[PDB]
Amino acid sequence: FPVRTVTVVVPFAKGGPTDTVARLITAEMAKTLGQPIEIENMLGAGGTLAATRVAHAAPDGHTLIVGHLGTHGAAVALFPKLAYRPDKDFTPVALLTEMPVLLLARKQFPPKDLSEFASYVESHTDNLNVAHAGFGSVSYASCLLLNRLLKVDPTGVPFSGTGPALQALVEGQVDYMCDQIVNAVPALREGKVKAYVIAASERDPVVPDVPTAREAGLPGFQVGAWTGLFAPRGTPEPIVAKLNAAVSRALDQSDVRTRLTDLGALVPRPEQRAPVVLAQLVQEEISRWEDVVE
Numbered sequence: 001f002p003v004r005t006v007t008v009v010v011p012f013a014k015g016g017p018t019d020t021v022a023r024l025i026t027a028e029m030a031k032t033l034g035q036p037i038e039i040e041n042m043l044g045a046g047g048t049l050a051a052t053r054v055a056h057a058a059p060d061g062h063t064l065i066v067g068h069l070g071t072h073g074a075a076v077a078l079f080p081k082l083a084y085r086p087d088k089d090f091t092p093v094a095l096l097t098e099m100p101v102l103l104l105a106r107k108q109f110p111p112k113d114l115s116e117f118a119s120y121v122e123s124h125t126d127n128l129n130v131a132h133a134g135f136g137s138v139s140y141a142s143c144l145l146l147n148r149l150l151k152v153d154p155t156g157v158p159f160s161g162t163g164p165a166l167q168a169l170v171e172g173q174v175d176y177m178c179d180q181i182v183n184a185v186p187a188l189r190e191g192k193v194k195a196y197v198i199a200a201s202e203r204d205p206v207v208p209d210v211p212t213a214r215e216a217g218l219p220g221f222q223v224g225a226w227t228g229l230f231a232p233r234g235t236p237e238p239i240v241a242k243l244n245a246a247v248s249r250a251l252d253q254s255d256v257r258t259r260l261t262d263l264g265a266l267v268p269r270p271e272q273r274a275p276v277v278l279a280q281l282v283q284e285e286i287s288r289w290e291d292v293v294e
Helices: 017-033 049-055 070-078 114-124 138-150 162-170 181-189 237-251 254-262 275-293
Strands: 006-010 037-041 063-068 090-106 129-132 155-158 176-180 193-198 224-232
Touching (some): 017 162, 017 181, 017 254, 049 063, 063 090, 070 224, 070 275, 114 138, 114 193, 162 181, 176 181, 224 237
Parallel strands (some): 006 063
Antiparallel strands (some): 090 176, 090 224
């Protein structure tokens, strides 16, 4: 293993955070595996179609899925009739990264802080559009958490990913969005959108002028977006061991550490790299979003 090109399926549109992470790590992975890795962007069913098709793929290790806090976590609690169990229909391979989520808005969004932001959504809640990438998305899970904390229910506008959703925010076609920091950073650095808060305990040094949800009065708004590599259930443990080690050696490449960390994402630490660390994150994420619904 491998005997041919490995397919790594991404549930979201090219250019977005999940795609950006997967392309960066999987290219370096080819050096350990001895075969090239093909990225397939497979859209549909609010980010869950990819995971559904890979739940049903041959468990030979040649067909893998990138999952995250949405597709393999919050989706259980938030997605009616989810077609898979993220714990039991997948063999976890590797944690790829973890990063905070940011509340972004269009440049000219009139609220200047989270105080004003709550009042203005509470007041215009008909005419407002919140962007997400479907009920299996981080963007959706994060905006549902924020909107329930602030007791507002504006219209959601579904996108094929936060890549397209971000461009919609840049053109002011939508009002706000909760997004993964790796997607948000380049737009912020060009001044094309603004962040109100980071859904984290601590400020992120790549966006140090953005206040935590805690310091801006909403400590319940904490979303640590993990991204993971999974295989179909029953993928042999040796094939899983070799893929996992390929991720580990990829994460050690200078090119990968500096690209991940420059965009505000963490490099999984050595003690975070076992397949079970990711299985434990799936279990905790599933329960966390069951609590949010309750």
